[model samples]
Target: MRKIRNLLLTLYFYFIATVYIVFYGGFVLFRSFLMRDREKARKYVLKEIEKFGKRAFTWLFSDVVVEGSENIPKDRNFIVVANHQSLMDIPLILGFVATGAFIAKEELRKIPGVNWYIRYLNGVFLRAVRALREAIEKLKNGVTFIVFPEGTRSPDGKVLSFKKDSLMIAVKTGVPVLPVSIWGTYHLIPKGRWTFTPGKVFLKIHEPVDPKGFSSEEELRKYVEEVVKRGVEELKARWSK
Candidate 1:
């Protein structure tokens, strides 16, 4: 019965994605002429694109529950470190990450349409070795970057330790680190399964941690990673268990 429900949901997504892509494409062209002077016009189109994503991904799964969105800062730029789960994390971030850029896997930049949205528009795709360098550049210009410290989707529901490699972005950039916890993404798209199960996802935003006070970059990295790792561990206890 679950399998049949999943199949029907997949088909429903195909139908929705088809119409949505066409409509959004037209909006982009028209907005090119219509919204010329506004800085946020592109983001508005991306938000419109998000409407489809919210609808499409929700159809594939049952539900998404996010907490702490009201806590995110709209005016300030800071590094966001989130728990790694699955592809669903991208959509969740898309709808909620206001004025923020995502640091995504280098491989995702090659993924056609999805790449255009993230790489060209919403600021996804990052090279691990170059992330700190790039993030420092952004900070100099007042842009913010977000990363999933775990680096890849969890193979099991357990929230494994983070590499802290991405933490260098915050330490070197001299930006505050914001730790974000996501629970239940593993249950939404279970490991090794194309089929999705409906579940509520939780996101908790930890208040910003300053990086400038650390003695060195290494200390800063360790400091921020400890904060994020604890958040993920707590999330695992609640959602992955």
Candidate 2:
């Protein structure tokens, strides 16, 4: 029965996505004539993604719960460091947290229609220098950047050790760090699985941390990692119960 439900949900997911892509492509052509501005285009694209992500998940999943959304700051640049669980985490944050950009794996840029949106948002791929340059530029423009410091998806749904110096942007750029925790997405679509499990995902926004308040960048990174780690565990306990 679960397998049948997953199959149906997958069909519904692609159907909904294809319909939106059709409309999104034409809208892009129209927006192209309006301006060649990257910032303007980025904002427009992210907002559209937020709308689509919200609608797509509603149609594809059972439910979602967003907590501590008020923790997201208004009128400032910030770095969002979150736990990595599943691809669903991207849309969850984009739709529910703040209008911002995030680091994308290199291969994601190969998707026909999807690459256009990632490029417009200045998503970084492999090179550290270029990623840092792009991230700093976005921060200067008051846009948030979501990063999963673990550097890889957890195979068992537990928080992984953050890559060394992964939070450098938060301290170096001096943007406040927003620690976000996500759980249940792993259960929705776990590693090596391609089917949905029809479950609720929880995204919790922890309070923002001031980089300057920390003794050093390493200290800041460690602290934020712990905060998100704890949040993830707590959110899982509450939601799973």
Candidate 3:
């Protein structure tokens, strides 16, 4: 019975998401061409994406509990360092933490409607120096960038060691790094799984760390990793009760 429900929910979610991406994405593309102010168009698209994310959690019957929103710096652009759990982490962060472009695999650019939004939001592609340069430029222009420093999701929901290279952008640009801990996404759809499980997910946004304070990228990476690891443990312990 649970399997059937999961399958139905997954199909419904894809259907809704596809329809939304096609129609709303087309509208956004059209409006962008007409709108003279590029910044305004970007903001409008981000807002719409945030709304879609929140609605997606609702559609999947998952309750998202967000905490530490106050930790998000409102005055300036920053980099978000998070532990990767599931694909849902993207939408979760967008809806609750901040609406920002995330570093993604270059292959994801092959998807049709999804690629359009990714480009519109200035998403950086992995493994390319040109893409890395573009990301740095975007950050210097006050665009927030979200990164999963783990490089991949953990199969057992444990926090993995962060790759130091992901912190290079923060180190070079001196942007504040926000360590965000996410729990419950693994249970929804763990690694190697394709179905959704309805449940409550928790997000803990820890205080931002100043990249300027650290002397090297590895030192800053380890510090933020510890913060997110501890935050994840705290969230798991609190909500598991």
- The per-model lDDT (C-alpha) reads 0.66, 0.80, 0.86
Best by lDDT: 3
By lDDT, the candidates rank as: 3, 2, 1
Worst 10 residues of 1 by lDDT: 119-128
Off by over 4 Å in 2: 28-45, 127-129, 239-241
Q: lDDT at 95 for candidate 3?
A: 87
The best candidate in terms of TM-score: 3
User: Over the stretch 1-241, how does candidate 2's per-residue lDDT look in tens digits?
Assistant: 7788789998888777776755675586468658779677756766777886677678775577888988888878678889988878877777888656777777887776666666655566764458788787778777778888998889889999998889888877889999999988898877778777778888889999999998787898899989999998898788354
Candidate 2 shows a clash count of 0
Question: What is the TM-score of candidate 1?
Answer: 0.80
For residues 146-220, could you state the per-residue lDDT of candidate 1 as single tens digits? 677777778876666666455777766677777777667677776576666677776677777787787775676
Best to worst by TM-score, what's the order? 3, 2, 1
Which lDDT tens digits does candidate 3 get at residues 9-122? 999988888888888778877887788898897677778888877988888899998889899999798898898899999888888888888877878889788888777767
